[PDB]
Write a structure and sequence with these properties.
The structure is a homotrimer. By secondary structure, chain A is of the alpha/beta class. Chain A has helices at 136-141, 186-190, 287-292, 317-320, 329-340, 345-356, 361-364, 382-386, 388-397, 422-433, 445-452, and strands at residues 13-14, 34-49, 52-59, 68-71, 75-82, 93-94, 114-120, 125-130, 145-151, 161-170, 180-182, 196-199, 212-215, 219-228, 233-238, 242-247, 254-257, 259-262, 267-273, 278-284, 296-302, 399-405, 408-414. The first copy, chain A, folds into 3 domains: 1-155, Immunoglobulin-like; 156-328, Cupredoxins -  blue copper proteins (Immunoglobulin-like), CATH 2.60.40.420; 329-454, Cytochrome Bc1 Complex, Chain D, domain 2, CATH 1.10.760. Chain A is globular. Chains in contact: A-B, A-C, B-C. The interface between A and B is large, with 65 and 61 residues. The complex binds heme C (HEC) (3 copies), nitrite ion (3 copies) and copper (II) ion (3 copies). Chains A, B, C: Keywords: Heme, Iron, Metal-binding.
Chain lengths: 454, 454, 454
C-alpha cells in the first residue's frame, strides 16, 4: 500500500488541535506514530454578522472545526465526543481516510456519548472532514466541517506563517444582515441560494483587527477549505499571485496563478510571498458572494513601500466598504440596545458611522462634502433638512432628475438600496442628521418599515 | 493531422454498444478500421424515482445512452435512427468529432427516418455526445447524452472492471419525490434549479442491489460523464482516493485526488484500487444534490477487512439514509396501489418501513426505542397514540419544548420535514402505528394534505 | 523578484489598445519599457439584444473593455479618465498587478476627473481587469471588465489570428428578449440568476456577419476572459479541440481538450488549428446559457472540405436556431417601428421571418411544409386559417391530441413556448399568415398579451 512505513513506534501522541485561523506546528517526526485525536461536537449560538445570531453545530467550538495535523503512515485513534447539551446526534467523515464513509458508521455519537475508530493515514494531502449524519446537508450547512493535514514523511517546506481559512455557504430564514437569531432555511439550502458566504464562519472573521499578518519578504502558506455545502469557490487573492496551488494530495502543482476553482468539499494548499505592504484580499470571485454576502478575508503585509513595483495607496472603503475599518462593534452594540429597549441617539450615530463607509461615502465622501455639481453634499444639506421622510425614500428607492442642494443643481442618479435593512437605513440617517451641522434628531427602524411598505 | 494511421483496413466492424453501467470490451486492434455505429432514439416513460414517471428521450433506450468504443484513427460511419413512435426530431453532436456541429447538421432525423455521416476519430479521449436539436436544452434535459471512448492506438492499461456512470440534472414540474407522471419544467431548467440530480437517469440506479461490484485488490476504471444540461459536478468518492483522473483527451493526468470538478458536457476517466471492503459512495459533493436530489452511486467492495488500515463498520442508514437497503420497491408498489384505488394498510406499512430508514431512524432508532431522555421512543409511544393528528403536524412542522413520553421528560428539537410529500408522511406514520405494539390503523395522503393546508 | 529585467529603456511607449474582438500586435521588444496606458470610462446605452437597450458602464466604450498588451518587466503608468457624462465614480483593479487592490485605491476617479498610478508588470500571463468601486458587483454586472496580456520576454509563439472573447452574466429587470431600455436588477444579481449570458456584451456579437474568421490550416489564439460577475463558464468549442489551454500566468498547460472551466474573474489563452471548413461554436456548455440566454460565438473557417475527416454539412438553424442567419436586424427595425407607432405588416413579416428559424422551422420546416402525418404544415394550413386566436394559444400553451390539418390526422405534441415575448409571438404569426398562400392580415403584441392573461 502507499504510506507503508511499518507499525507505530515511539510513544502514543495526543494530537494538539488548533482553532482557526491558526495551524498546529509541523509534526517534525521521522517515524510513524499512534496519534490519539479527541474532538468534541458543540452546538451553540454565535454571531454570523454584527447583531445576527445563528445556532452553529461545531467540531471543537469553532467554524471551521479544529485543525488536525498528522504524518502519512500514522495510525490515528479518533475519539468523537458529542457534548451533552447537543440536541442532535453527529458523526465524522474524513476525506483521505481509506474505508467506507471515511469513519461515518463507527463515529455515530448521541448527545453525551463518545465513539472511536482507528485508521491508517495512507494518503498525504490536505483534506476536508465533515459531519455525515442524516440529513447531511443540514449538518454541513450549520458549520460541521474542517481540515486534516496528512504531511508527507519529509514534512512540507518551511514558511514564515501557516494559516487556516475555510469557505462555507449559509442559509438563514432572514435576509443578509437582518438582525436577531436566524433559523436554518432548508428551502434556500436545497435551492443553493445562500444568504451568507463566509470565511471562518462569520462576516469580518478575517478583516480589520482580525486580519492575518505577515511582513514584506515573508512566505505564507494558507490551508484553504471549501466546506460548502453547495458552492464552488472562484478562490482569488486581490493584488497578488499564488506561487503554488496544490489540491488535496494531488501530484499536480499549479504555479503562478491568481484565481483557482475549489470544489465543494475540496481543499488546497496555497503559497504567497509578500512583496509590497498593504491589504491582500482573499475572495470568492463570484463577485456578489465577496461584496454582498461576506466572502472576503484580509492578509495584511507590513514593511517598506517599493514605488518601482507599485506607486499606489493601501485599500480603503471604496473597495472594502464597511470592512475597511478595524471592526463594526457599534452595530453589535446598537442591535443589543434595540433588544433591551435602551437604544440612544449616540448608539444609532456610532452604528450609522460604521455602515456609512463605502455604502454612502463612495459618492457623498467620508465628510459628506460630495463633489459640487456631481454628488450633492450630505454636510449641512438644505435638501436633507427640508424633509427627513424624503431621505428614507431616497435611500430605499433611489433618486433621479434635477434637484437643487445648497444652491447647486444636480441632474444625476442615486441607485436604490432596498437590500439595506430598516435598522441599517435608520442608523445611517441618524448618523448623517447628527453630523456636519445637520439638524440632529433620529430615524427609527419603525419609521423606515412604514416608508418601505408605502 | 493527429490520428494519421492511414485508410481503414481489415473488414468493416459493426460496433457493439453497451447499456449503462457496462462498457464494451477493449477494441484490442493494431490497425485502423471502418466502424459502423447504429444508434436509435427512443422516447419513453421510465421511473426517475419510486412511483415517479418521466418521459425520457434516449439514445438506445437508456439514460445515459449506449456507450460507443472506437480506436483513434478509425473511420466511423454513424447511422442515427429515430424510432417511428417519436414525436420530436433528433440529431447528434459528438465531442471529439472534427467538423461543424460534431455531426449535428447531417444527423437531423425525423420520426421513422435514418441519417448517416462519416467522421475520422482523430482525437483520443473520453467524450460526451448529446442531441443538438432546437431547443437543445430541452433535448439534453430529457436524457439525450452518453459517452464515446476513442482509445489510444495501444489501448488503455488493463483493469479488473470498467464501468459507465453519467451525471444529469433533471427539471420536473413537481417537487422531488412527488408521485405521478412529471412533465419537463422549462422555467426550472432556464433558472438552473433542478428537482433531481442523478447518476444513470434514476434515483437508486447504482445503489443497493444495483451497486457496482469489485473485490479487495482489484482495479476499477470508471468512465464518468456530466451530461448536464447545466450543473458542474464536484465529483467525489467517499472513503477512497482516485489513483488517476484524466479529462477528455487531455495530456494532463492528476494523481491521488478524491474530489474533481467535471464541467457541464465534460467527461473523465478515473481509476480506483480496492483496498478494504465496504460501500464507496460516488457523489456530487455539492452536498444537497447528493443527499437531497439523488446524486449518489455505490461501488461495493467484497473481501477481507484490514483492521490496521480501517477498524470501522460498513456504511448504514445514518449516512446513506433510505438508500442503505437493497431497494425501495415497496414505495413503487404502494404508489401503483393508490393509482388503482386498492392501497392496503400493509402496502402503506411496507412503503413507510423503507422511508423510515435514516429519515426517522437516525434519532428514533430502527426499532423506535430512541434514547431515554435524549430522543423519545416511537415504540409503544403514549404520546403518539394520544393524538395521531398531532403526529402529522410534528413530521411536517417539527416539535420543540418540554414533552412527556412514556414517563420521561424531553426538552429537545425535532426539525420540520416539510419537504416530505403527503404520501411519504402518511406511509411513514402508518408504518409506525402498525409497529412496536402501537395501536394500528392508518394515515392517508389526504389526511396529511389537510394538516399541511392548516 | 520575478520580471527582474532592470529599469525602463528606449523611449516611453503610448500603448495602442484595441476594441473586441481584436488584439494589439505583439510588442516585439527585447527591452523593458515605460508604457503609458490611457483608458477612459464611458457610461452609455447599447443594444444587449435586438430591440433591447441596456446602460453599460465601459472601459473604452466597449464590453469587454479595451485590450491592453505589455511585456513582463515593463513599468506601466496607468491613466484612468472618467468621462464627464458619467454619473458614477469608477476605478480599476488589474489582476497580475503586485499591490493592494491591484490599483483600486489610487485609481478612484469622479466624473470629469483623471487618476494615475504606476506598477511594474512582474507577472507574465493573461489577466482580467475590472472596476472595484462599491457596490463592486453592480459595476462589473454593467460591463466594467477586460483583459491585460503581460507577454513573456521572448513573446508568445506566432499564430495566424489572435482574437479577444469575454463572457459576462447580465441582470435585467425584464425577461430575456423583452424589448425596451432594461434596468439593472440587483435582486437577480444577488441570486446569481442572470437574464443574459453573453460573449462581448451582446446577443449575436460574434455570430453571423460578426463571426471570427480563419482559413483551413491556420492557427488561431483566443484570449478568453470571464468577467462574471458570478458565473463559472464550462467553456467549450463545438466540433473542434483546443491544442492548448493555459490559465492566467500558470506554469501548467493542458493540451488536447474540448471543455475547460473558467472561474469568475478568470482568463485563459486557448489555441485552435483549423482542419475542416465550417462554423465552430464557442459556448458555455451550461447548455441553457448557450441556447437560451445568448452564450454562443462563431469561428467561421473557409477552405476545402476533407470528406475523409468529416462527410457532414455546415451548421444550420436546427443547431444555431435564429443565429444561423447573418443578422436579425429586421427585429431591431420592427421594435423601433412599434416605439414610433409606425409598425407595418411588412415590418412584422421580416421580424417573424428572422425569429421563425429554428424556433418553428425545426419541426414545420423553413418552407412550412412540415412532414405529412408527423409535423403538420403551416403552408396553406386550413387549421391555422380557421382560427388565428387558437394559433396564439398553440404557440404560448402548446398543442396535443388528434387534429386534422389539410386532410391528414396528427396525434403528436407541440411543447408550449411561453418564454416567447408578446411581440415575438405576434411577429412570428404575422410572418406565417403572410407566407405560403396563407390568408394574410396580422397579429399584434396586444392580441397576444390578452391571450396570455387568459
Ligand atoms: C453611487 C452614488 C451614490 C451612493 C452610493 C449614494 N448616493 Fe446619495 N445621492 C447620489 C446622487 C447622484 C444624488 C443626487 C441625485 C439626483 O441628481 O437626482 C444623491 C442624493 C442623495 C440625497 C438627497 C440630496 C442631498 O444631497 O441631500 C441624500 C439624502 C442621499 N443621497 C443620501 C445617501 C445615503 C444616506 C447613502 C448611502 C446609504 C447614499 N446617498 C448613497 C449618489 C449616491
Ligand atoms: C434529528 C432528530 C430527529 C429526527 C430525524 C426525527 N425526529 Fe422525531 N423527534 C425528535 C425529538 C428530539 C423529539 C422530541 C422533541 C421535543 O423534545 O420537544 C421528537 C418527537 C417526535 C414525536 C413525538 C414524541 C414521541 O416520541 O412520540 C414523533 C411522533 C416523532 N418525533 C416522529 C418522527 C418521525 C415519524 C420522524 C421521521 C419522519 C422523525 N420523528 C424524525 C427527533 C427527531
Ligand atoms: C418540436 C416540434 C415543434 C415546434 C418547435 C413547433 N411546432 Fe407547431 N406543431 C408541432 C406539432 C407536432 C403540431 C401538431 C400537434 C398535435 O398533433 O396535436 C404542431 C401544431 C402547430 C399548429 C397547428 C396545426 C397546423 O399545422 O396548422 C400551429 C399553428 C403551429 N404548430 C405553429 C408553430 C409555430 C408558429 C412554431 C414556433 C413558434 C411552432 N409551431 C413550433 C410541432 C412543433
Ligand atoms: O480582484 N478582483 O476582485
Ligand atoms: O465525503 N463526503 O461526502
Ligand atoms: O457540443 N455541445 O454543445
Ligand atoms: Cu452533525
Ligand atoms: Cu433530441
Ligand atoms: Cu465602475
Amino acid at each position: 500500500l502507499p504510506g507503508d512505513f511499518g507499525p507505530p513506534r515511539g510513544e502514543p501522541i495526543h494530537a494538539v488541535l488548533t482553532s482557526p485561523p491558526l495551524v498546529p506546528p509541523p509534526v517534525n517526526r521521522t517515524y510513524p506514530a499512534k496519534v490519539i485525536v479527541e474532538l468534541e461536537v458543540v452546538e451553540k449560538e454565535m454571531q454570523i454578522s454584527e447583531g445576527v445570531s445563528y445556532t452553529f453545530w461545531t467540531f471543537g467550538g469553532t467554524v471551521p472545526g479544529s485543525f488536525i495535523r498528522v504524518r502519512q503512515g500514522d495510525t490515528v485513534e479518533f475519539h468523537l465526543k458529542n457534548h451533552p447539551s447537543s440536541k442532535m446526534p453527529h458523526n465524522i467523515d474524513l476525506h483521505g481516510v481509506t474505508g467506507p464513509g471515511g469513519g461515518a458508521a463507527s463515529s455515530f455519537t448521541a448527545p453525551g456519548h463518545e465513539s472511536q475508530f482507528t485508521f491508517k493515514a495512507l494518503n498525504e494531502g490536505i483534506y476536508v472532514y465533515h459531519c455525515a449524519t442524516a440529513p447531511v446537508g443540514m449538518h454541513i450547512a450549520n458549520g460541521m466541517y474542517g481540515l486534516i493535514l496528512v504531511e508527507p514523511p519529509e514534512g512540507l517546506p518551511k514558511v514564515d506563517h501557516e494559516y487556516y481559512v475555510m469557505q462555507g455557504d449559509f442559509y438563514t430564514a432572514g435576509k443578509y444582515r437582518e438582525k436577531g437569531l436566524q433559523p436554518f432555511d432548508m428551502e434556500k439550502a436545497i435551492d443553493e441560494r445562500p444568504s451568507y458566504v463566509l470565511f471562518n464562519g462569520a462576516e469580518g472573521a478575517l478583516t480589520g483587527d482580525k486580519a492575518l499578518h505577515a511582513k514584506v519578504g515573508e512566505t505564507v502558506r494558507i490551508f484553504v477549505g471549501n466546506g460548502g455545502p453547495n458552492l464552488v469557490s472562484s478562490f482569488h487573492v486581490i493584488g497578488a499571485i499564488f506561487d503554488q496551488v496544490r489540491y488535496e494530495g494531488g501530484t499536480n502543482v499549479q504555479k503562478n496563478v491568481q484565481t483557482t476553482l475549489i470544489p465543494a468539499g475540496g481543499a488546497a494548499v496555497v503559497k504567497f510571498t509578500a512583496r509590497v505592504p498593504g491589504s491582500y484580499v482573499l475572495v470568492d470571485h463570484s463577485i456578489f458572494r465577496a461584496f454582498n454576502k461576506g466572502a472576503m478575508a484580509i492578509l495584511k503585509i507590513d514593511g517598506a513601500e517599493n514605488k518601482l513595483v507599485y506607486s499606489g495607496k493601501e485599500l480603503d472603503s471604496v473597495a472594502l466598504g464597511d470592512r475597511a475599518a478595524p471592526n463594526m462593534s457599534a452595530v453589535t452594540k446598537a442591535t443589543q440596545a434595540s433588544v433591551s429597549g435602551t437604544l440612544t441617539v449616540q448608539d444609532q450615530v456610532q452604528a450609522g458611522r460604521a455602515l456609512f463607509a463605502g455604502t454612502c461615502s463612495v459618492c457623498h465622501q467620508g465628510n459628506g462634502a460630495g463633489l459640487p455639481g456631481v454628488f450633492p453634499p450630505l454636510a449641512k444639506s438644505d435638501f436633507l433638512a427640508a424633509d427627513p421622510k424624503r431621505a428614507m425614500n431616497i435611500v430605499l428607492h433611489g433618486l433621479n432628475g434635477k434637484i437643487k442642494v445648497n444652491g447647486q443643481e444636480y441632474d444625476s442618479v442615486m441607485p436604490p438600496m432596498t437590500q439595506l435593512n430598516d435598522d441599517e437605513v435608520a442608523n445611517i440617517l441618524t448618523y448623517v442628521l447628527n453630523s456636519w451641522d445637520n439638524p440632529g434628531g433620529r430615524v427609527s427602524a419603525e419609521d423606515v418599515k412604514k416608508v418601505r411598505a408605502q
